[PDB]
Amino acid sequence: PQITLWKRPLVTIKIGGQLKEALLDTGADDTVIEEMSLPGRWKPKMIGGIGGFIKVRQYDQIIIEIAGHKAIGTVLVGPTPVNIIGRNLLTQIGATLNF
Amino acid sequence: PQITLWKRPLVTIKIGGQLKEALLDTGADDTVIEEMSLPGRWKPKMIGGIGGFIKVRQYDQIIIEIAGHKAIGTVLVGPTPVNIIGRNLLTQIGATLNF
Ligand SMILES: CC(C)CN(C[C@@H](O)[C@H](Cc1ccccc1)NC(=O)O[C@H]1C[C@@H]2C[C@H]3[C@H](OC[C@H]31)O2)S(=O)(=O)c1ccc2nc(NC3CC3)sc2c1
Ligand SMILES: [Cl-]
Ligand SMILES: [Cl-]
Ligand SMILES: [Cl-]
Ligand code: NA
Numbered sequence: 001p002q003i004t005l006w007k008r009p010l011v012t013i014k015i016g017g018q019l020k021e022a023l024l025d026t027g028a029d030d031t032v033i034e035e036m037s038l039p040g041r042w043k044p045k046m047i048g049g050i051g052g053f054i055k056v057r058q059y060d061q062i063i064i065e066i067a068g069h070k071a072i073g074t075v076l077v078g079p080t081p082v083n084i085i086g087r088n089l090l091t092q093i094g095a096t097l098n099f
Numbered sequence: 100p101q102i103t104l105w106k107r108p109l110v111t112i113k114i115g116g117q118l119k120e121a122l123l124d125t126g127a128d129d130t131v132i133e134e135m136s137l138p139g140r141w142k143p144k145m146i147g148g149i150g151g152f153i154k155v156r157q158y159d160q161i162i163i164e165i166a167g168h169k170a171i172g173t174v175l176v177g178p179t180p181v182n183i184i185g186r187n188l189l190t191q192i193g194a195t196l197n198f
Contacts, residue, residue, distance in 0.1 A: 003196040005186040009125050024196055026108050027124030027183060032149065049149020050131070050179055069198065080149055084126055087104040090198075097102040097123055099168065099194040 001067070011067040013085065015075065020083050022066075026097055028086030031064075032076045038062055045076060054078050069093035100166070101197075112184065113164040114174070119182055121165070125196060127185030130163075131175045137161055144175060153177050168192040 003009045009024040016038050030047070042057040056078030063072050066085055071092035102108050108123040115135060131146060131153075141156040155177030163170050165184055170191040 001198065005125060005189045005194060005196070008128070008186075009196055023126050025124070025126030026104060026196075027122050027126045027181075029107065047149065048180060050146065051148055051152050052150030054149055067198075081147065082126075087107070090104045093198050095104060095196055095198040097104075097108055097125070097194055098197050099100065099166075099189075099192050 011085070013067075013083070014065040015062065022083035022085045024066075024090065024095065025084040025086055026090065028084045029088065030074065030076050031086045031089050032056065032078065032080045032084045034077075034080055034083055036077060038075065038077060042077075047076060047078075049080075054080065056080075064089060066093050110166040110184070112166075112182070114161065121182035121184050123166075123189065123194070124183045124185055125189065125194075127183045128187065129173065129175050130185045130188050131155060131177065131179040131183045133176070133179060133182055135176060137174065137176060141176075146175060146177075153179060155179075163188065165192050 013022045038059045045058045046053045056076040062075040073088045112121045137158045144157045145152045155175040161174045170188045
């Protein structure tokens with residue numbers, strides 16, 4: 001698909017058996033999801049955004065389905081105001097910015 | 100161009116006759132630049148994201164070149180960690196997301 005940018009580029013994802021709405025975010029290195037449980041090992045991380053830093057849990061090797069496309073990668077879980085799909089997963093679904 | 104996302108989508112912008120680096124950011128509604136001088140009057144705004152928010156100065160109808168493409172629109176100036184080109188200007192340069 002081609003997604004215009006007149007509105008936020010929101011998509012449905014499936015993660016951890018749950019459906020969520022998330023923003024396709026070329027400005028995000030990593031994927032950051034609101035509080036939820038995920039299986040397996042995690043480690044803490046601090047990540048900076050516009051308003052300073054938040055503490056997150058880093059889960060590696062998490063499968064995800066983004067607007068129907070599967071991939072796998074690291075997911076950060078914590079108190080983000082928006083669920084964001086970052087470049088680490090956008091690459092895997094073949095997303096590009098075109099102009 | 101077609102910009103893949105294996106690295107950050109950094110481009111050169113020109114604003115006030117000077118070149119700066121900025122992130123093409125589909126997750127940003129608005130364009131936010133580090134402290135600089137711009138002409139005219141400004142209005143107040145707050146913009147929030149990961150970590151919380153920053154207070155910025157809103158300048159309207161500013162001439163800005165993004166990756167060689169000419170735009171004229173709103174620029175927010177304040178203590179952002181990174182210069183961000185948001186959807187207000189990405190739509191002026193004709194950018195879409197594609198996969
Ligand atoms: C979080 C999203 C939803 C909004 N932001 C754009 C976003 O692309 C921001 C842009 C950004 C990049 C880096 C530092 C600060 C901001 N990305 C972001 O925080 O991603 C984090 C993810 C993790 C941790 C790190 C690493 O990569 C960067 C960073 O991986 S924002 O906070 O920078 C921003 C920008 C413009 C803007 N305009 C607004 N307009 C107001 C609503 C009417 S609100 C707003 C918020
Ligand atoms: Cl990853
Ligand atoms: Cl590729
Ligand atoms: Cl604008
Ligand atoms: Na894991």
